[model samples]
Target: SRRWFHPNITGVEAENLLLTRGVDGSFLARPSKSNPGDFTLSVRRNGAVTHIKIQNTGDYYDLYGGEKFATLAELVQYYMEHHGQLKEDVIELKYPLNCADPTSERWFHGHLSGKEAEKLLTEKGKHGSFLVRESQSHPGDFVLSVRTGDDGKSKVTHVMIRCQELKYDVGGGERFDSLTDLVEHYKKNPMVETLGTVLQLKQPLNTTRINAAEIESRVRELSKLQGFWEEFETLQQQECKLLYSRKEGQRQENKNKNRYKNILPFDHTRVVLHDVSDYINANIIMPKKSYIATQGCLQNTVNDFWRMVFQENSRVIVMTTKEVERGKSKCVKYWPDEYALKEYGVMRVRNVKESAAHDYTLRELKLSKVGQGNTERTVWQYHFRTWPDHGVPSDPGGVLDFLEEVHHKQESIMDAGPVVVHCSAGIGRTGTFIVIDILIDIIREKGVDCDIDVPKTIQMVRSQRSGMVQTEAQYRFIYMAVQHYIETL
Candidate 1:
């Protein structure tokens, strides 16, 4: 059969013996944790076992050519020349006996025994597909994942040393209804389930949900978008940014420190980000930022870096904190100077989407939003689209609500200007916030998501602004956060 890639397959498993390299120049065999009758087959040359992993049953056809019995001896012979550059180096009938079918790559179902497996161990196909050699046994049981295929599940279900494939099926096509149902049957098998635990380290991290090209796209975009730029020379007039060093070996300490970046400034008069893209088309800006975020390498706290690059002349301001909790990297910031920071306002947009112009006294009004509530237009304001655990409980509704009020007021009062946002890097999170906002509008009207995708978003935004929510976490968070708004509304 020709090697093929399909989606319907789930998994393949079998029962066999496990052989390992012993300490006293002998081989060991033990029951595999993942499969019953399946003993582990650890490879050892002299004293320690070598990790020359074998391919899974399903991948046999694709990796080599689909032939029956398909022992590891057949595998090394087809792929490598263990005979010192000979045509083939057939593995001995030493390790795995039973295996998954050649179509395991497509729709792995069950283990195969009988004449096919026995013939594979003793003979080689005329196609020069595989070879087998003889060897001593090893001790100990262990699970090992051999191959991953087009289907989301793993192939080469289990690797045993000296046992036969376990038969879970009751009869002819009578085991289960569909591949999914059949896979469920294997899950109930204590022996099969144990294989999962033994092969944990051998499993490949990639799956059908993640494509290699898509992941690379994010990395490439960030390589170009991060860093600082200035235009209006206005925010630059003051020391508006903040900078901090990385905390080593501290996981919890890293929890979205960029959350503070692009924070609404208390002093409204001074713009935080010098770029105008947040007020215009940010297509390029969004993708570039997402690339950096996915990489998890942030620049500064959200408020610091972009606060320096920001610029605006309009009466009203835009606010963003769209993508934070999603594991994208933080936007970066750097303070130009400290003395100049006294000119801006810093209002926490937690409890209320409406501006709090009338809630405070004279001093509070100096740097805060000038309006009375969510409806009022003001120079300074705060809003949330996605709320983390640390955020105010009431603000949990998210940022789109806050943006809706701001968007409505912008037209009502003719107050329009560049909005400010910052995370550790100021690109990914910032870029995604704007991208998701624009995407929601597009999807509502045009029915397309990639139009506002990260790379595309970054490209458009960067042409006008320096950083567009520049982090991977920022890029990923907005996708669901925006969907949540659509679902809830």
Candidate 2:
């Protein structure tokens, strides 16, 4: 189904959906409850929802008057571009609350224009490489774009996939129940044009782009393809070639600051304490996301952790491991008890309030500089407790919810510094969480149609903090978390 069309919803339901899930100018189209075969456009405007009736006369569609369009998609697209036409009060339709995708297959690229599909296939595909995407002109139909020739002489061919009676098929072929079945059938038996030209479907040019709200299907498809292992192995192989200096981490004075002797931050990306001699077992990762990946606090380095947090002006701290796991000291008790105060170097921290969620604890701490007047800052520490040591959570839903809550708090504060994320070694779970958050942010800003390279994203973080996303399980968990997040969206 096209995202903007809500076939079975009522006017009230549309209003609620738009008001809750949408912002100003966000809109969707639904079947008119009173007028059969007619449609209603629901848009969020100012602070309320506005419903504009659309007349479907079996010939053309319009907003009761003005310019007409053959299909509903064109009518919406027209208003999106040309503003101040719908009504005197309604200026334009800004954002479309896109519906979930019909399928999760990597070859099914949703909402892609013909030009985009051609560019993607031509640049990234080989002969017989093909992908299925939604038709730009047609509302419910699809288009299959394929590259048929060799490298230099390659050309893209677009074939329309007609949707009839809820079944899918090409111009002439057997109808299939689903897009996946149609693609699968064509992979075995090639199609022929009227001029006797063979249109082969030897390989699929998979898309990393996905609808944020349809990640559940993406996860299911990736599981069938064993995509996590394949992508992670490629990332693992690239590690050996990424050699950077860690001289600062290896220095004698900084040896004890690291939670694990072998796990150290890269010299170029390591955080430096301006007031002190500039050494901390933390790396500034994802400058775009403003994140700092660091190790769990050690017994002796607890002061250093607070120092870094204060110096960086960080408002949020994400702890992915417990202080002790399996009778082992994974991290020290870095914060004071609730309603208690503790001093770390020149910074004094007071734990004002602590709250518990399903799988984590949130502590509200007030930080003040010693003898530096009455100015203070509030810092939140989200300590996740359900994640097993060196293993992944049974489900990705909890982790996704946890990160959402953390980000909600972080974004509320203006000029908030980099969010500090850490686990025992700060590379495995820390890297996993950061990668998932980074990708989620991208999808949120660019919609689900944007391309995301998981392996490349992990490699980018690993370059700054070595051995990030440690085990294969951790790497796979990143995909699961992202999938779960998109499903929630």
Candidate 3:
């Protein structure tokens, strides 16, 4: 007849929660035979058994130990307090699977083989393990990561796995059959995923497809639209939050502007960030919604940047600015570095993986909402480091190749949302990339000479997001890059 303190309990959850916190115990709740309305809590630890009368007050609990607690949380706190336990002794509830339960998947997964375990001793080790992959080349040595600072992911300790008996030039150590002997020595070791994994790293468009005719029609419509450029300029001036001032030579009168209209807004409750001023959702000739163009994240807006990504359900982010250009900060490190668990507002980001190429660095980020526990989503950050601000890439081939990668990655986000494209101020190079994406698609759908209107296509973009092509140089680069993309076919 006893009712559950919470109907959601399977008994195991509470037990695991307590055990992880150092309160080793098995918990059981069952009906009270004497009183249908009453219940009992049985806790067994280290051969000692304790039974406490538990009475539910609908919304709260009254412990048999003479305590009236408002919530289950208070009841747990008071119980631990009197049991000679500090608050820290109780582990955070991770709900780890019970390996003893045969029905559980983890119960049957079994342990790694000797060879399998030795594989972990290699560079495959993430940022937080006893042996990291970086130290694998030291012959017969391993790198042990330690937590000497508040950021647990940064510390490193090198340990030698002497195998001189094997006699070689590498670690000049043991010619052991395998590293299994060394790895098994630390079987129960602590390790962490790569810094990228620690961060939560993880597009768009549109219409059926934009043909050359539609591209031409949009361009023509944009030409007769009087005072459109003036309207575009005015919108860019409305809500300005410049992260870094442009360099003197890099700045130009008409080209240096960010936009305010048709921008993407996060659906956050604490604040009204609906009009972040510098972020806009632009359309491609083919799809109704193809891309998100926004300024490089500022120091303060870094959190909002990811929040918008989560809010828009955007799975891919294309970043054009390097961390620095010349001597100025062109883009904020909005992404988490190695072992970084950055909390921006309610969104938490972990850098899960990072791969660098000759011209770009691709990162995978994992994102989740804090306080609510970790339910994760992923984002891919494609950073083109070689592209210069206000200047075209020395070669358009690399740029076109980058555009292809971004498109494919955007599609591979498991059909999530729009692709986000950004440079400084969320225009300039941002717009160039977007423009090329559209033209390349049109050319593929039709032909390279299918009367594509490059000028009007850019103007159509300006109607959605201002100053998409920052300068004439960018405009020309668009044509050259598209031509190169065509030649690739």
**Candidate whose TM-score is highest:** 2
TM-score of each: 0.28, 0.59, 0.44
Task: Give the candidate order by descending lDDT.
Answer: 2, 3, 1
Model 1 vs. true fold: TM: 0.28
lDDT tens digits by residue: candidate 1, 367-485: 22224434222333343333342222232144656555544544464434444443322333444555665655555555433233433344455433333433223433454455455
Q: Which lDDT tens digits does candidate 3 get at residues 1-489?
A: 011122223445545533553243544443344642345565655544345676642212445645543223334433443554312233222121222121111101122232343443232333333422223455544333222222354443433334345421124333433243333323333223445222110000011123443443443442473222322222222212111122221224312222221122222211223534333223222233377766666675676677677776888888887767667665678888855678887788899889889889998888888887756887888888887543577679888888888877776667677788876556567778888888787776666556565655765665554346654456556756765665566
lDDT of 2 by residue, 64-88 (tens): 6445442455466557767977785
Ranking by TM-score: 2, 3, 1
- Supply candidate 1's per-residue lDDT for 434: 58
Query: Which 10-residue span in candidate 2 carries the lowest summed lDDT?
Result: 56-65
Query: What stretches of model 3 exceed 4 Å from their correct place?
Result: 1-289, 446-451
True-vs-predicted CA distance for residue 242, candidate 3, Å: 22
Q: Provide the lDDT at 102 for model 2.
A: 43
Model 2 stretches astray by more than 4 angstroms: 1-218
